[PDB]
Amino acid sequence: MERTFTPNVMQPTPLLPTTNDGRVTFGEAFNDLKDLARRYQLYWEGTILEGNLRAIRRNSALVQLPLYPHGLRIQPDVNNPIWNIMRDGHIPVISSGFRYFRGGLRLRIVVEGLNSCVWVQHHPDRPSIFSRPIIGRYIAAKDAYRNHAYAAYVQNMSVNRTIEVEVPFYQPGLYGMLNASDNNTANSFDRLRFTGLGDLLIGIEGEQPIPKEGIEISVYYSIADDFSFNIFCGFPPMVYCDETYSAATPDL
Amino acid sequence: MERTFTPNVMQPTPLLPTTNDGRVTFGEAFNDLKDLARRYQLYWEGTILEGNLRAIRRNSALVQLPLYPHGLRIQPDVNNPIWNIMRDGHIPVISSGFRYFRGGLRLRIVVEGLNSCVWVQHHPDRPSIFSRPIIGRYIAAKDAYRNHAYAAYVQNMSVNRTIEVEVPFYQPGLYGMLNASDNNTANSFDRLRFTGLGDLLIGIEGEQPIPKEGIEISVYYSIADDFSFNIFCGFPPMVYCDETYSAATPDL
Amino acid sequence: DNPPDPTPAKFFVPIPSHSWAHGTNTSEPTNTLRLDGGVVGVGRSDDIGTSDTAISGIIGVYGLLKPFDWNANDTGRNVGGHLLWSMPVHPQVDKDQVIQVMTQSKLTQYYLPPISVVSSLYAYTRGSIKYKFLFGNNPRHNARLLVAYIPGISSDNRLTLERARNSAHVVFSLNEVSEFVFTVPYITDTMWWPRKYGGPQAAGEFVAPSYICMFILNPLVAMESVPSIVTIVPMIAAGDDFEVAVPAQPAVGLSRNIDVIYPKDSIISFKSGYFPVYVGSWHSFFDSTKAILRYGAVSDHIAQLGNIPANVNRKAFWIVVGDTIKFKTKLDKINGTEWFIPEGEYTLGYGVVWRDGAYAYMVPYPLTPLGEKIAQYTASLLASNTAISQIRPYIPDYIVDSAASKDNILWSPIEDR
């Protein structure tokens, strides 16, 4: 099989004795990318002010969040230092080498600055066809308000400011597409219902005003236990993080 | 063996009957320095004001903390009464008698005055070559912001103002050097990657302003269960704590 | 019945969340958004494989490296003892040994092999590496090569065939053979070796431990009815003994978005009234045979740079950020190197600062991988106060004045190995 084809081997020395993927020297093993994809990373983070929400905030949504195992399309700007120099996390880098998947994701919503209550819904039959989130007053009514019968969780910030949920796989097909394009008209159906786990909506439930500094919502994510990165195609070409901010100014 | 060589013994009385290292009189034994090194002590403590951080605080780091089993190089001044008269803790005193080590450390970060969220990362492949911490706006971008894929912990101060983490040993060699010098050019490689456990970064995640009194961060540390003080070389010369503040003014 | 329960309360410590770092060998409490409240997992069948994230199966797949031509008619190069190809040995490949795509004002795209991609996710690495060499030949071509693994060496500064034979090496015969693999050893003074490329501002970076070099033993022979050039395509994969230690900030990012915002505090430009600029010549700089940026045709009208911050490394060269210009330059092959710039029209991508007293001037360089190397080398020569006469061959030549810029040109500090 050509991908691993090694003809006419010329090997001067014997192989190097094993450490069981680090288990001999350190106390743990490192043999599967799936394990690393289960270590949380930043999915999206933003600040929301009263001006971003509807004039009359009738317990409306704060964030409409599309759920992709390969993460969102990052926007590196002066306001987002992480995406600019850290770029994409490990999970989007891992995901890029595989075509398909079939599992769920585990999220962690951290809301700071708000004394009210937060509601979270999962819309598996309504996933976005764009790789960017929708904020506040730009969210359509169909999603801006709590829908019935969807799997949900409602949490008071007074008890805990961190929400922990696991989003399931509810798709009509065999696989979900990894690394999908937002420019897709020839296969809209694939992009619409065979790509994302369904939008996750994060809203507020109370009359408390938002501080002038605003509230900050940080969504971390990771792969669930039933998740699988399925068919290994090539890796795409990469960029180097050390080529964002140069070492010509070692401290900056 | 010369270090314990005792020739021509002259002993007037028999030995003193045992108490099993205090277990007979008090309820516990005292036979190993490793046990004392597992009792927490102050590692570093400081106050941070808005003026110490970047003008635009984009969830940037508060403290860049180098991790040494033998502790930091203390600075005794009028603002730091502990280091001035208590000097170095027991762990730096214990560490001074040994050349090497191979284990992890256990930390405890206590953050007071902040209502926001705190993030903590461990950078095992990026340990500092200096025995002093870096604060706020002086922290380079590569460390000032949350990096991906590193072992981390994110904690809301609303639930608990004390963070408990254990930092592992992730070094490419056999030993880590104890009592290492900051003036080291002939062996930069040893000082860079075979000395410290890797920097620990403590940052803030939220838009909440810092009070005019500032926030205070107190990091305590101790030896982990897998830790070992390894090769006994000499003790270095010591200073006496009773020679800081004199008893000539018994109350002061 | 309502019996009291005076059982003593337990001490418990409240924390807001479960582990953020743990990814294996533990349970994770969570609120599952399902109708079934038990331990639930999506259904499967043979239609849906198991996760193919086993590292060894990934890094075992060969990735392509920068190919090169092997010309049988080159009576200069095609001789015994000649170094055809060489580089440091480490899982991430050197950037200049990998296929690239550059974009003005954006980041470079690198085609990294699977072993390189995976390694950039971890801090340490170790083991043998399989270097497969593919030759574009037919049964007429013949040669013998000596490829060597030199432990503890990072460059070819002291490297000769007659020294390379004194390390672990193999001798390959190209007699009706097109593929062979050189599984190189792992020879180190330690058990794990730190990755070379790390994070922003060279965070946690280091160097490679060893060197691989291909020498000409018996030169390539062809005939008159057969191609005189034989291309060689190097490929790389992990040996069966390869391992990766410790999760760290990825050295890499995806190429879906190659945008980048360079730090505003490091940006430099020309003083007001000293722009627009164009590429030209003036007498006090190698008798006006070399290229510099001018702001006018009167002489001693050489564009001056604004204030250059003191935190900028002395050995650093510069890269253009905003709009730029095209200019025609050339550079003749430099002795002891394969460094030459053919005469053509190139975009301005790099610059090196030439200081003359209280005035600072900027020297233009082409936006090309070789232009990046020559610019860096020149900046280093200015750093060691090298003779002005010895830096001369590393500076692009003056051919003709080029177009002017729309306005000022912005530059950002960079530095390479």
Place this chain on the structure above:
Amino acid sequence: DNPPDPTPAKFFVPIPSHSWAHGTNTSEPTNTLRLDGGVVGVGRSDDIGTSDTAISGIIGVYGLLKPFDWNANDTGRNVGGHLLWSMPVHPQVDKDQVIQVMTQSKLTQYYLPPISVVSSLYAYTRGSIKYKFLFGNNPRHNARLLVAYIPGISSDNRLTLERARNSAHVVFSLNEVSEFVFTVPYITDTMWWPRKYGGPQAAGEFVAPSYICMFILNPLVAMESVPSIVTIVPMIAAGDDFEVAVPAQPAVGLSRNIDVIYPKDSIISFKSGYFPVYVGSWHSFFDSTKAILRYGAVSDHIAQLGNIPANVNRKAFWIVVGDTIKFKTKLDKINGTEWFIPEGEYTLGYGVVWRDGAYAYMVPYPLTPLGEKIAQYTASLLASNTAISQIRPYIPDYIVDSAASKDNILWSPIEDR
């Protein structure tokens, strides 16, 4: 199925953290920063020993104490009954029996033995102590010594050979023997004995329970073709029966940073116009044969000290904090002691306050371990209103006026045993 769970809630008590004091015989919940979420510990091999922190193995190692010379030609000292060497017995050694390094304006560095270092970490101590004595002799030298352990005595004020023989003691013969160990007993009215040196401001300090003394039984003999001086190097280690009870504030700190900031509230100096100062003489003070600090050459121009706070102990002497001066002084050997200062140039390190009515004057002392002792003893004599004529031999002599100070001189209160 969705059965209700009406099981009564339990009372629990929230606390922010786990134990801070516990270091053994318990588990510690914590968030491990690893990828493996189980009970994980770093790997090991024979290349990496086990922790060598077992106390008995540490305090068993001998440490060196202050050596001394034993001169066979000293017809005064080298006689039967003479006390060669003596000190209190306790695990921390007396400060004046340990090798020292002093630094102007900084802390003194002490070379403490392993048994001394470890003991400073704990509050109590008990057991036998091994005192090894090493002699610089060859087969010509001969003597006999009587070393004794005197329980319940802290000084040699009532100590004679003919009394020392009435306690536990040993008699050593130096006949072709260079090393011997005197394992002294532990004789106390209680089971644990409090450490001597504690913390800042003598926090939790106490005294030693017993005394060790070396007497000359048969005086040292040498010959003409052989060195007449025999050096004796005392060393100390813990006996097999030695134990340490209770963790407390370390009596010691590292010497990596010997800086110290003395309390500003205790600092004293000279009144304005009464500085700069120099060391000199005046008539009303032992006919101008002793050293005092003057501010001018007109007489009755003796530097006056500023306000001295009432919280300062009456028996306390002083130490210079900032800049200082050098001065030439001397002191002849005092009867019944080995106290003498040879004529030389010394830095000014210590001072004792001499009161004359509403005016307070300062007497200079050399920055030397013996100068520290003589200064302290003098301050004590002034405290008991000792005769002015009897304090005279404890004051440095006047030789010649010394250089002046740059400006005022600052002093800080200190006190010794």
